[PDB]
């Protein structure tokens, strides 16, 4: 794949790793909608709202399969470790008007 998943389900905001690149989800938006990282970086999304949110990459973007991330409740987090350069678009499954991208370079 182009990313590995440290944890298939969400974990507490306080448990975010040292060195992770954090994207907040607040005000019904990915607060960094275009994030630039390097190969081997871990990106961690943190849901700051009552409404659940995820990140969803369609098939062919992070790998053969779609990556439909788990729904994060308020103050939960979810990480992806990017292992290959590219441009990776995502949305929220529940709220597809929420769009973001990670650029790995
Ligand atoms: Cu959402």
mmCIF file of N, CA and C and ligand atoms in Angstrom:
data_model
loop_
_atom_site.group_PDB
_atom_site.id
_atom_site.type_symbol
_atom_site.label_atom_id
_atom_site.label_comp_id
_atom_site.label_asym_id
_atom_site.label_seq_id
_atom_site.Cartn_x
_atom_site.Cartn_y
_atom_site.Cartn_z
ATOM 1 N N UNK A 1 0.853 -1.177 0.000
ATOM 2 C CA UNK A 1 0.000 0.000 0.000
ATOM 3 C C UNK A 1 0.898 1.239 0.000
ATOM 4 N N UNK A 2 0.324 2.410 -0.112
ATOM 5 C CA UNK A 2 1.032 3.662 -0.016
ATOM 6 C C UNK A 2 1.004 4.252 1.391
ATOM 7 N N UNK A 3 0.277 3.580 2.295
ATOM 8 C CA UNK A 3 0.241 4.010 3.692
ATOM 9 C C UNK A 3 0.014 2.768 4.551
ATOM 10 N N UNK A 4 0.489 2.799 5.750
ATOM 11 C CA UNK A 4 0.192 1.768 6.737
ATOM 12 C C UNK A 4 -0.648 2.400 7.841
ATOM 13 N N UNK A 5 -1.365 1.567 8.549
ATOM 14 C CA UNK A 5 -2.346 1.936 9.542
ATOM 15 C C UNK A 5 -1.843 1.520 10.919
ATOM 16 N N UNK A 6 -1.315 2.406 11.733
ATOM 17 C CA UNK A 6 -0.836 1.972 13.058
ATOM 18 C C UNK A 6 -1.956 1.332 13.896
ATOM 19 N N UNK A 7 -3.137 1.911 13.828
ATOM 20 C CA UNK A 7 -4.258 1.451 14.661
ATOM 21 C C UNK A 7 -5.529 1.428 13.842
ATOM 22 N N UNK A 8 -6.152 0.295 13.643
ATOM 23 C CA UNK A 8 -7.364 0.219 12.880
ATOM 24 C C UNK A 8 -8.501 0.914 13.602
ATOM 25 N N UNK A 9 -8.431 1.020 14.892
ATOM 26 C CA UNK A 9 -9.587 1.821 15.368
ATOM 27 C C UNK A 9 -9.044 3.089 15.988
ATOM 28 N N UNK A 10 -9.899 4.028 16.353
ATOM 29 C CA UNK A 10 -9.489 5.318 16.867
ATOM 30 C C UNK A 10 -8.918 5.212 18.269
ATOM 31 N N UNK A 11 -8.204 6.267 18.657
ATOM 32 C CA UNK A 11 -7.603 6.290 19.984
ATOM 33 C C UNK A 11 -7.714 7.711 20.508
ATOM 34 N N UNK A 12 -7.361 7.919 21.778
ATOM 35 C CA UNK A 12 -7.643 9.193 22.448
ATOM 36 C C UNK A 12 -6.718 10.273 21.928
ATOM 37 N N UNK A 13 -7.218 11.500 21.791
ATOM 38 C CA UNK A 13 -6.362 12.619 21.386
ATOM 39 C C UNK A 13 -5.074 12.678 22.211
ATOM 40 N N UNK A 14 -5.074 12.411 23.502
ATOM 41 C CA UNK A 14 -3.920 12.499 24.394
ATOM 42 C C UNK A 14 -2.854 11.465 24.049
ATOM 43 N N UNK A 15 -3.220 10.485 23.251
ATOM 44 C CA UNK A 15 -2.331 9.398 22.864
ATOM 45 C C UNK A 15 -1.636 9.662 21.539
ATOM 46 N N UNK A 16 -1.789 10.813 20.913
ATOM 47 C CA UNK A 16 -1.089 11.165 19.683
ATOM 48 C C UNK A 16 0.411 11.028 19.889
ATOM 49 N N UNK A 17 1.076 10.417 18.894
ATOM 50 C CA UNK A 17 2.501 10.194 18.916
ATOM 51 C C UNK A 17 3.359 11.446 18.820
ATOM 52 N N UNK A 18 4.503 11.484 19.477
ATOM 53 C CA UNK A 18 5.553 12.435 19.162
ATOM 54 C C UNK A 18 5.886 12.384 17.679
ATOM 55 N N UNK A 19 6.028 13.544 17.086
ATOM 56 C CA UNK A 19 6.395 13.592 15.664
ATOM 57 C C UNK A 19 5.239 13.405 14.728
ATOM 58 N N UNK A 20 4.034 13.034 15.208
ATOM 59 C CA UNK A 20 2.909 12.973 14.276
ATOM 60 C C UNK A 20 2.530 14.338 13.744
ATOM 61 N N UNK A 21 2.024 14.362 12.516
ATOM 62 C CA UNK A 21 1.598 15.591 11.868
ATOM 63 C C UNK A 21 0.090 15.708 12.081
ATOM 64 N N UNK A 22 -0.427 16.593 12.940
ATOM 65 C CA UNK A 22 -1.839 16.609 13.309
ATOM 66 C C UNK A 22 -2.673 17.479 12.404
ATOM 67 N N UNK A 23 -3.781 16.944 11.972
ATOM 68 C CA UNK A 23 -4.868 17.643 11.279
ATOM 69 C C UNK A 23 -6.065 17.623 12.197
ATOM 70 N N UNK A 24 -6.528 18.800 12.634
ATOM 71 C CA UNK A 24 -7.730 18.928 13.412
ATOM 72 C C UNK A 24 -8.964 18.877 12.530
ATOM 73 N N UNK A 25 -10.022 18.267 13.039
ATOM 74 C CA UNK A 25 -11.334 18.301 12.414
ATOM 75 C C UNK A 25 -12.196 19.132 13.358
ATOM 76 N N UNK A 26 -12.538 20.319 12.895
ATOM 77 C CA UNK A 26 -13.288 21.267 13.733
ATOM 78 C C UNK A 26 -14.030 22.183 12.779
ATOM 79 N N UNK A 27 -15.125 22.728 13.291
ATOM 80 C CA UNK A 27 -15.977 23.545 12.435
ATOM 81 C C UNK A 27 -16.350 22.848 11.146
ATOM 82 N N UNK A 28 -16.633 21.543 11.194
ATOM 83 C CA UNK A 28 -17.102 20.749 10.068
ATOM 84 C C UNK A 28 -16.170 20.807 8.856
ATOM 85 N N UNK A 29 -14.875 20.924 9.117
ATOM 86 C CA UNK A 29 -13.868 20.951 8.088
ATOM 87 C C UNK A 29 -12.612 20.254 8.579
ATOM 88 N N UNK A 30 -11.845 19.727 7.624
ATOM 89 C CA UNK A 30 -10.468 19.359 7.897
ATOM 90 C C UNK A 30 -9.677 20.670 7.944
ATOM 91 N N UNK A 31 -9.140 21.016 9.094
ATOM 92 C CA UNK A 31 -8.627 22.371 9.275
ATOM 93 C C UNK A 31 -7.354 22.628 8.492
ATOM 94 N N UNK A 32 -6.671 21.610 8.060
ATOM 95 C CA UNK A 32 -5.565 21.699 7.120
ATOM 96 C C UNK A 32 -6.012 20.903 5.897
ATOM 97 N N UNK A 33 -6.702 21.499 4.956
ATOM 98 C CA UNK A 33 -7.276 20.695 3.855
ATOM 99 C C UNK A 33 -6.229 20.268 2.831
ATOM 100 N N UNK A 34 -5.060 20.867 2.798
ATOM 101 C CA UNK A 34 -3.970 20.419 1.943
ATOM 102 C C UNK A 34 -2.712 20.376 2.796
ATOM 103 N N UNK A 35 -2.278 19.177 3.142
ATOM 104 C CA UNK A 35 -1.153 18.952 4.014
ATOM 105 C C UNK A 35 0.000 18.386 3.199
ATOM 106 N N UNK A 36 1.200 18.949 3.372
ATOM 107 C CA UNK A 36 2.398 18.452 2.706
ATOM 108 C C UNK A 36 3.275 17.740 3.730
ATOM 109 N N UNK A 37 3.606 16.465 3.489
ATOM 110 C CA UNK A 37 4.463 15.716 4.380
ATOM 111 C C UNK A 37 5.545 14.982 3.600
ATOM 112 N N UNK A 38 6.474 14.383 4.311
ATOM 113 C CA UNK A 38 7.520 13.561 3.690
ATOM 114 C C UNK A 38 7.242 12.088 3.903
ATOM 115 N N UNK A 39 7.896 11.271 3.072
ATOM 116 C CA UNK A 39 7.771 9.815 3.193
ATOM 117 C C UNK A 39 8.162 9.369 4.579
ATOM 118 N N UNK A 40 7.377 8.488 5.162
ATOM 119 C CA UNK A 40 7.569 7.950 6.491
ATOM 120 C C UNK A 40 6.909 8.749 7.567
ATOM 121 N N UNK A 41 6.286 9.910 7.224
ATOM 122 C CA UNK A 41 5.559 10.651 8.229
ATOM 123 C C UNK A 41 4.225 9.974 8.577
ATOM 124 N N UNK A 42 3.862 10.136 9.824
ATOM 125 C CA UNK A 42 2.549 9.725 10.317
ATOM 126 C C UNK A 42 1.690 10.964 10.422
ATOM 127 N N UNK A 43 0.538 10.934 9.752
ATOM 128 C CA UNK A 43 -0.472 11.960 9.870
ATOM 129 C C UNK A 43 -1.546 11.460 10.813
ATOM 130 N N UNK A 44 -1.959 12.328 11.734
ATOM 131 C CA UNK A 44 -2.980 11.975 12.678
ATOM 132 C C UNK A 44 -4.113 13.020 12.643
ATOM 133 N N UNK A 45 -5.309 12.552 12.311
ATOM 134 C CA UNK A 45 -6.502 13.361 12.355
ATOM 135 C C UNK A 45 -7.091 13.274 13.747
ATOM 136 N N UNK A 46 -7.562 14.425 14.270
ATOM 137 C CA UNK A 46 -8.192 14.466 15.594
ATOM 138 C C UNK A 46 -9.549 15.129 15.474
ATOM 139 N N UNK A 47 -10.606 14.436 15.848
ATOM 140 C CA UNK A 47 -11.957 14.962 15.800
ATOM 141 C C UNK A 47 -12.244 15.799 17.048
ATOM 142 N N UNK A 48 -12.519 17.061 16.838
ATOM 143 C CA UNK A 48 -12.814 17.968 17.937
ATOM 144 C C UNK A 48 -14.293 18.229 18.085
ATOM 145 N N UNK A 49 -15.188 17.666 17.322
ATOM 146 C CA UNK A 49 -16.603 17.862 17.398
ATOM 147 C C UNK A 49 -17.463 16.679 17.835
ATOM 148 N N UNK A 50 -18.698 17.004 18.260
ATOM 149 C CA UNK A 50 -19.658 15.992 18.657
ATOM 150 C C UNK A 50 -20.040 15.070 17.519
ATOM 151 N N UNK A 51 -20.134 15.646 16.336
ATOM 152 C CA UNK A 51 -20.510 14.818 15.196
ATOM 153 C C UNK A 51 -19.327 13.908 14.851
ATOM 154 N N UNK A 52 -19.538 12.629 14.653
ATOM 155 C CA UNK A 52 -18.423 11.757 14.252
ATOM 156 C C UNK A 52 -17.923 12.099 12.859
ATOM 157 N N UNK A 53 -16.644 11.859 12.635
ATOM 158 C CA UNK A 53 -15.993 12.053 11.352
ATOM 159 C C UNK A 53 -14.969 10.917 11.091
ATOM 160 N N UNK A 54 -14.703 10.694 9.809
ATOM 161 C CA UNK A 54 -13.608 9.793 9.446
ATOM 162 C C UNK A 54 -12.791 10.448 8.338
ATOM 163 N N UNK A 55 -11.877 9.665 7.771
ATOM 164 C CA UNK A 55 -11.217 9.941 6.531
ATOM 165 C C UNK A 55 -11.408 8.729 5.630
ATOM 166 N N UNK A 56 -11.674 8.979 4.353
ATOM 167 C CA UNK A 56 -12.027 7.959 3.363
ATOM 168 C C UNK A 56 -11.306 8.270 2.079
ATOM 169 N N UNK A 57 -10.485 7.336 1.617
ATOM 170 C CA UNK A 57 -9.735 7.400 0.366
ATOM 171 C C UNK A 57 -10.309 6.346 -0.545
ATOM 172 N N UNK A 58 -10.725 6.689 -1.761
ATOM 173 C CA UNK A 58 -11.327 5.709 -2.623
ATOM 174 C C UNK A 58 -10.278 4.708 -3.142
ATOM 175 N N UNK A 59 -10.774 3.614 -3.733
ATOM 176 C CA UNK A 59 -9.873 2.576 -4.236
ATOM 177 C C UNK A 59 -8.870 3.160 -5.254
ATOM 178 N N UNK A 60 -7.659 2.675 -5.204
ATOM 179 C CA UNK A 60 -6.641 3.154 -6.133
ATOM 180 C C UNK A 60 -5.868 4.353 -5.661
ATOM 181 N N UNK A 61 -6.198 4.892 -4.482
ATOM 182 C CA UNK A 61 -5.516 6.088 -3.981
ATOM 183 C C UNK A 61 -4.422 5.671 -3.002
ATOM 184 N N UNK A 62 -4.709 5.027 -1.871
ATOM 185 C CA UNK A 62 -3.694 4.560 -0.945
ATOM 186 C C UNK A 62 -3.240 3.152 -1.218
ATOM 187 N N UNK A 63 -3.849 2.501 -2.176
ATOM 188 C CA UNK A 63 -3.665 1.086 -2.482
ATOM 189 C C UNK A 63 -4.813 0.619 -3.312
ATOM 190 N N UNK A 64 -4.873 -0.692 -3.499
ATOM 191 C CA UNK A 64 -5.892 -1.298 -4.332
ATOM 192 C C UNK A 64 -7.244 -1.034 -3.732
ATOM 193 N N UNK A 65 -7.410 -1.275 -2.431
ATOM 194 C CA UNK A 65 -8.719 -1.099 -1.823
ATOM 195 C C UNK A 65 -8.941 0.355 -1.414
ATOM 196 N N UNK A 66 -10.208 0.721 -1.300
ATOM 197 C CA UNK A 66 -10.581 1.907 -0.575
ATOM 198 C C UNK A 66 -10.096 1.788 0.842
ATOM 199 N N UNK A 67 -9.679 2.898 1.422
ATOM 200 C CA UNK A 67 -9.450 2.948 2.877
ATOM 201 C C UNK A 67 -10.546 3.818 3.440
ATOM 202 N N UNK A 68 -11.479 3.185 4.087
ATOM 203 C CA UNK A 68 -12.591 3.813 4.772
ATOM 204 C C UNK A 68 -12.269 3.780 6.262
ATOM 205 N N UNK A 69 -11.757 4.895 6.789
ATOM 206 C CA UNK A 69 -11.316 4.948 8.139
ATOM 207 C C UNK A 69 -12.452 4.817 9.133
ATOM 208 N N UNK A 70 -12.137 4.473 10.352
ATOM 209 C CA UNK A 70 -13.188 4.345 11.382
ATOM 210 C C UNK A 70 -13.703 5.710 11.761
ATOM 211 N N UNK A 71 -14.966 5.788 12.185
ATOM 212 C CA UNK A 71 -15.540 7.002 12.693
ATOM 213 C C UNK A 71 -14.908 7.376 14.041
ATOM 214 N N UNK A 72 -14.372 8.571 14.121
ATOM 215 C CA UNK A 72 -13.786 9.127 15.327
ATOM 216 C C UNK A 72 -14.879 9.867 16.094
ATOM 217 N N UNK A 73 -15.045 9.504 17.370
ATOM 218 C CA UNK A 73 -15.949 10.311 18.213
ATOM 219 C C UNK A 73 -15.172 11.536 18.657
ATOM 220 N N UNK A 74 -15.879 12.444 19.339
ATOM 221 C CA UNK A 74 -15.221 13.652 19.815
ATOM 222 C C UNK A 74 -13.988 13.286 20.644
ATOM 223 N N UNK A 75 -12.899 13.981 20.375
ATOM 224 C CA UNK A 75 -11.603 13.850 21.043
ATOM 225 C C UNK A 75 -10.936 12.494 20.791
ATOM 226 N N UNK A 76 -11.285 11.845 19.690
ATOM 227 C CA UNK A 76 -10.575 10.697 19.191
ATOM 228 C C UNK A 76 -9.758 11.057 17.948
ATOM 229 N N UNK A 77 -8.826 10.168 17.661
ATOM 230 C CA UNK A 77 -7.779 10.349 16.661
ATOM 231 C C UNK A 77 -7.571 9.072 15.860
ATOM 232 N N UNK A 78 -6.973 9.232 14.704
ATOM 233 C CA UNK A 78 -6.685 8.146 13.772
ATOM 234 C C UNK A 78 -5.487 8.518 12.901
ATOM 235 N N UNK A 79 -4.579 7.572 12.724
ATOM 236 C CA UNK A 79 -3.343 7.807 12.039
ATOM 237 C C UNK A 79 -3.150 6.986 10.758
ATOM 238 N N UNK A 80 -2.418 7.579 9.821
ATOM 239 C CA UNK A 80 -1.902 6.893 8.652
ATOM 240 C C UNK A 80 -0.417 7.248 8.504
ATOM 241 N N UNK A 81 0.407 6.242 8.233
ATOM 242 C CA UNK A 81 1.836 6.444 7.985
ATOM 243 C C UNK A 81 2.078 6.318 6.490
ATOM 244 N N UNK A 82 2.485 7.406 5.860
ATOM 245 C CA UNK A 82 2.603 7.421 4.406
ATOM 246 C C UNK A 82 3.999 6.896 3.997
ATOM 247 N N UNK A 83 4.016 5.933 3.089
ATOM 248 C CA UNK A 83 5.254 5.264 2.731
ATOM 249 C C UNK A 83 5.717 5.513 1.305
ATOM 250 N N UNK A 84 4.959 6.259 0.512
ATOM 251 C CA UNK A 84 5.294 6.518 -0.888
ATOM 252 C C UNK A 84 4.841 7.901 -1.257
ATOM 253 N N UNK A 85 5.582 8.612 -2.063
ATOM 254 C CA UNK A 85 5.263 9.915 -2.580
ATOM 255 C C UNK A 85 4.003 9.857 -3.450
ATOM 256 N N UNK A 86 3.162 10.870 -3.400
ATOM 257 C CA UNK A 86 2.006 11.006 -4.219
ATOM 258 C C UNK A 86 1.069 12.065 -3.653
ATOM 259 N N UNK A 87 -0.116 12.129 -4.221
ATOM 260 C CA UNK A 87 -1.133 13.083 -3.790
ATOM 261 C C UNK A 87 -2.392 12.274 -3.529
ATOM 262 N N UNK A 88 -2.882 12.332 -2.307
ATOM 263 C CA UNK A 88 -3.876 11.413 -1.775
ATOM 264 C C UNK A 88 -5.087 12.200 -1.291
ATOM 265 N N UNK A 89 -6.145 12.208 -2.106
ATOM 266 C CA UNK A 89 -7.393 12.864 -1.786
ATOM 267 C C UNK A 89 -8.259 12.010 -0.868
ATOM 268 N N UNK A 90 -8.993 12.672 0.027
ATOM 269 C CA UNK A 90 -9.881 11.965 0.927
ATOM 270 C C UNK A 90 -11.104 12.844 1.191
ATOM 271 N N UNK A 91 -12.131 12.203 1.763
ATOM 272 C CA UNK A 91 -13.342 12.862 2.195
ATOM 273 C C UNK A 91 -13.862 12.177 3.433
ATOM 274 N N UNK A 92 -14.894 12.774 4.014
ATOM 275 C CA UNK A 92 -15.630 12.136 5.127
ATOM 276 C C UNK A 92 -16.798 11.321 4.606
ATOM 277 N N UNK A 93 -16.886 10.028 4.966
ATOM 278 C CA UNK A 93 -17.885 9.165 4.424
ATOM 279 C C UNK A 93 -19.302 9.686 4.675
ATOM 280 N N UNK A 94 -19.501 10.169 5.911
ATOM 281 C CA UNK A 94 -20.796 10.621 6.368
ATOM 282 C C UNK A 94 -21.165 11.992 5.794
ATOM 283 N N UNK A 95 -20.098 12.801 5.595
ATOM 284 C CA UNK A 95 -20.218 14.179 5.162
ATOM 285 C C UNK A 95 -19.345 14.462 3.942
ATOM 286 N N UNK A 96 -19.700 13.969 2.774
ATOM 287 C CA UNK A 96 -18.765 14.024 1.628
ATOM 288 C C UNK A 96 -18.442 15.430 1.149
ATOM 289 N N UNK A 97 -19.138 16.449 1.620
ATOM 290 C CA UNK A 97 -18.694 17.792 1.307
ATOM 291 C C UNK A 97 -17.393 18.113 2.027
ATOM 292 N N UNK A 98 -16.983 17.358 3.000
ATOM 293 C CA UNK A 98 -15.674 17.576 3.658
ATOM 294 C C UNK A 98 -14.589 16.870 2.873
ATOM 295 N N UNK A 99 -13.653 17.608 2.277
ATOM 296 C CA UNK A 99 -12.613 17.125 1.400
ATOM 297 C C UNK A 99 -11.261 17.616 1.880
ATOM 298 N N UNK A 100 -10.271 16.747 1.702
ATOM 299 C CA UNK A 100 -8.909 17.093 2.018
ATOM 300 C C UNK A 100 -7.955 16.333 1.126
ATOM 301 N N UNK A 101 -6.676 16.666 1.247
ATOM 302 C CA UNK A 101 -5.644 15.902 0.578
ATOM 303 C C UNK A 101 -4.359 15.931 1.397
ATOM 304 N N UNK A 102 -3.592 14.852 1.264
ATOM 305 C CA UNK A 102 -2.242 14.761 1.773
ATOM 306 C C UNK A 102 -1.320 14.665 0.552
ATOM 307 N N UNK A 103 -0.350 15.543 0.464
ATOM 308 C CA UNK A 103 0.702 15.512 -0.549
ATOM 309 C C UNK A 103 1.970 15.005 0.103
ATOM 310 N N UNK A 104 2.470 13.867 -0.361
ATOM 311 C CA UNK A 104 3.669 13.248 0.208
ATOM 312 C C UNK A 104 4.792 13.448 -0.807
ATOM 313 N N UNK A 105 5.862 14.115 -0.389
ATOM 314 C CA UNK A 105 6.948 14.439 -1.298
ATOM 315 C C UNK A 105 8.289 14.661 -0.639
HETATM 316 CU CU1 LIG B 1 -17.623 14.033 8.739
#
